[PDB]
Structure 1
C-alpha cells in the first residue's frame, strides 16, 4: 500500500538504494499502489556511478509491499519491506539483476522479464 511520500527499497542493480514515491500511475487519482503497479518516484539515495543518481525522477514497478495482498484462492502474502524495480517507459528493467523475492502478481501484469530475473517468485 504505497502512496506519495512512501519510501521504497529498490530491488535491483540500477544504483538506486532508496526511492520516494511521488505519484501512483493508475488513473486520475489512485490513493495506493500495490504489487504490479507503476509509480513515479524521486531517487532519494543511491550509490556512486549507477545508471540512476540521487535527484532523478524515475518510474518503478512495485514488487514487494509490507501490507499483505490477498489472492482469489483465499490466501495472502506479505513482505518485510516495500520494494520496487526501476523501469523504462516500456515496463522493462533498467538494470540487469533483481534482488529478493517478488510477487507472483507481477507475471499477470506483463512484467515477465522481472519475474524471470527474480531468484524467487512467491
Structure 2
C-alpha cells in the first residue's frame, strides 16, 4: 500500500531510477494507493540523460506492490517490490518500454498500452 513518502522503483526508460509519492489521486482524502491508481511524485535519482531529471515533479501509475492484492475470484498476488511507470497528463507512458511483470488490474483500469508493452501480465 503506497502513500506519501513511499519510495517506488521505476520500470521504464524515461531515465529516472527511483521516485517518491507526494500525493495519491483518489478522492478528497484517500489514505493509500494500489495498482492502477495514479500518484504525483518527485524524482530522487536518475540516470544521466533522458527526459526526466532528479528534482522533477512527475505523474505515475502503480503497477506492482509488496502488499498482496486480493482478486474477487478469491486468490491473490504479491511482488517483491513497489514499482511504477511514468505517465503524462494525458495519461500515456512517456517511456517506450517497461521492465519486469505487471498486475492485470491495470487492464481493468484502462492502462492498455502499458499492458501490451509489458513483458508479462500476472
Q: TM-score range by the shorter chain?
A: over 0.9
- 1:63 deviates by 0.2
Deviations, residues 62-107 of structure 1 (Å, cap 9, x unaligned):
0000000000100110000000000001211001000000000000
Distance in structure 2 (CA, Å) of the matches to 1:57 and 1:25: 15
CA RMSD of aligned residues (A): 0.5
Displacement of 1:29 after TM fit?
A: 1.0
Compute the displacement of 1:28 (Å): 0.5
The secondary structure found in structure 2 opposite 1:94 is coil
Structure 1 SS opposite 2:45: strand
For residues 51 and 106 of structure 1, the distance between their equivalents in structure 2, rounded to whole angstroms, comes to 25
TM-score norm. by structure 1 comes to: 0.99
2-structure distance, mates of 1:7, 1:21: 7
| Aligned-partner SS, 2:115 | helix
Q: Determine the structure 2 residue equivalent to 1:64.
A: 64
TM-score (norm 2): 0.99
Structure 2 unaligned runs (5+)?
none
Shift of 1:51: 1.2
Q: Which runs of 5+ in 1 are unaligned?
A: none
